[PDB]
């Protein structure tokens, strides 16, 4: 059947482009049409990543409020906190940390944390590094030692603690020498070890 005698773009295409350039209302429109604001493209690029690299504070706050996965790692293993750290963008780091960023999340390559990705060659390093350095030190100390779980976990050993996403867990013993990547914690009267990288200082947006 021959072909010879208003137009739109894919909503995912509008979202990723609008988040990088800074058209908030366009992002808001795309988000309503598509089902998931955390939808990545064929390259693993998500809306929040483009907003961070574009330094579009307005779009970042909206997407987080809209429930964008603040911990989704890209093809290189970089989480939204990692990109914000590489840009020395303290404001984004705060928004991410205050909305469920995994402070101790590590990249797939060289397994470094967000704090280690701060660029000492760009401006704003001191302000960003100091925040991330204090945030890492404050988990298990701040808010009376309470931290929020970001994923489900089924204990792998009897001395470990099981928990569901969103539950509040109290950190009792942090600097335990026998385990540097786990914390002794308490949940509903049960005590056991929990992985650092499964918790954020605040809960996700659900």
């Amino acid at each position: 059947r021959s072909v010879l005698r208003r137009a739109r773009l894919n909503p995912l295409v509008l979202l990723l482009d609008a988040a990088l350039t800074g058209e908030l209302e366009v992002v808001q429109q795309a988000v309503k049409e598509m089902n998931d604001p955390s939808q990545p493209n064929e390259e693993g690029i998500t809306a929040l990543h483009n907003a961070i690299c574009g330094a579009n504070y307005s779009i970042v706050d909206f997407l987080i409020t809209a429930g964008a996965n603040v911990n989704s790692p890209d093809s290189h293993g970089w989480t939204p906190l990692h990109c914000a750290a590489s840009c020395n963008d303290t404001v984004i780091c705060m928004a991410l940390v205050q909305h469920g960023a995994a402070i101790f999340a590590t990249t797939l390559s060289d397994g470094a944390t967000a704090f280690e990705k701060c660029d000492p060659y760009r401006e704003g390093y001191a302000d960003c590094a100091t925040y991330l350095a204090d945030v890492e030190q404050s988990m298990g100390l701040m808010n009376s030692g309470a931290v929020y779980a970001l994923w489900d976990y089924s204990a792998e050993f009897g001395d470990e603690l099981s928990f569901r996403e969103g539950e509040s867990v109290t950190v009792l013993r942090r600097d335990g020498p026998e385990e540097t990547d786990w914390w002794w914690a308490a949940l509903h009267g049960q005590e056991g070890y929990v992985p650092r990288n499964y918790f954020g200082l605040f809960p996700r947006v659900k």
Partner: protein, 300 residues
């Protein structure tokens, strides 16, 4: 004869990239002569309807063209509009143009080819196509291709909403009748509307019209695009002609898109290719052809 030609061109689908398909001189001349009839029988300013898949430059990268059809759907499963630049720079211009001309003859109402700036005797003489014809065939065949290219259509408008041409806008372009009145066969002039349609470029830094670094035609700014779209009740300009890293690249917010469909352009760039799908609802999405470049912690 057509089915035999298409079959032989598609035979290398499973082959290591680079393997030639050597048609006869008479076969290739046939493709040029028959398709030339069709181009002249159809409008110089095509009016097309969705669904359609729009592709940018190929530049003789035949095995990338085969992947393009593989992922997009071989004709006639999908309808295709190409925006020009089928020959030059790549090593297999002949196989590229022949397959495209063959499909044009087999599916003349569902497969369309626009003219790029390299579909011009004075350009493809310089950047490789003539060299390929002389090596594998003869000069007379290259002149036969020039006769065919001189009859290609120049622009297409999809469902009265997407304006497509190889290069871009022109300061001389005021009414669509100016395109329809262009008589074929024609060469591409050194300046003017027809030249600009195949040679001009958008520029983020120009307000209005500026000089083009290529030494030919002009550059146009974002306000030019906006003025053009509102004047002609169009929604999107789709063009090619420039390498773009992601295979597509937006301009003037989203009023213009550049497409480029040759990944790793002549082995000097690391760009991906893309084509744009337009469905019956005029929703535009992109398909990418890209060349090849939580864990619980341990315990003590």
């Amino acid at each position: 004869n057509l089915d035999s030609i298409i079959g032989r061109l598609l035979e290398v689908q499973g082959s290591r990239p680079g393997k030639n398909v050597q048609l006869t001189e008479n076969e290739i001349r046939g493709l040029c002569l028959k398709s030339r009839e069709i181009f002249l029988s159809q409008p110089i300013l095509l009016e097309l309807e969705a669904p359609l898949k729009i592709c940018g430059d190929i530049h003789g990268q035949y095995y990338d063209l085969l992947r393009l059809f593989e992922y997009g759907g071989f004709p006639p499963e999908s309808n295709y509009l190409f925006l020009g630049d089928y020959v030059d720079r790549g090593k297999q211009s002949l196989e590229t143009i022949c397959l495209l001309l063959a499909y044009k003859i087999k599916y003349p109402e569902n497969f369309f080819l626009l003219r790029g700036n390299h579909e011009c005797a004075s350009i493809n003489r310089i950047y490789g196509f003539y060299d390929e014809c002389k090596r594998r065939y003869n000069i007379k065949l290259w002149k036969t291709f020039t006769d065919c290219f001189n009859c290609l259509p120049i622009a297409a408008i999809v469902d009265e909403k997407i304006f497509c041409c190889h290069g871009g806008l022109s300061p001389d372009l005021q009414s669509m009748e100016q395109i329809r009145r262009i008589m074929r066969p024609t060469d591409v002039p050194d300046q003017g509307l027809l030249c600009d349609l195949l040679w001009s470029d958008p520029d983020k830094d120009v307000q209005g019209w500026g000089e083009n670094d290529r030494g030919v035609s002009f550059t146009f700014g974002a306000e030019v695009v906006a003025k053009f779209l509102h004047k002609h009740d169009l929604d999107l300009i789709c063009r090619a002609h420039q390498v773009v890293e992601d295979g597509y690249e937006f301009f003037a917010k989203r009023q213009l898109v550049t497409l480029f469909s040759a990944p790793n352009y002549c082995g000097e760039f690391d760009n991906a290719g893309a084509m744009m799908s337009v469905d019956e609802t005029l929703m535009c999405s992109f398909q990418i052809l890209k060349p090849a470049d939580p864990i619980t912690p341990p315990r003590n």
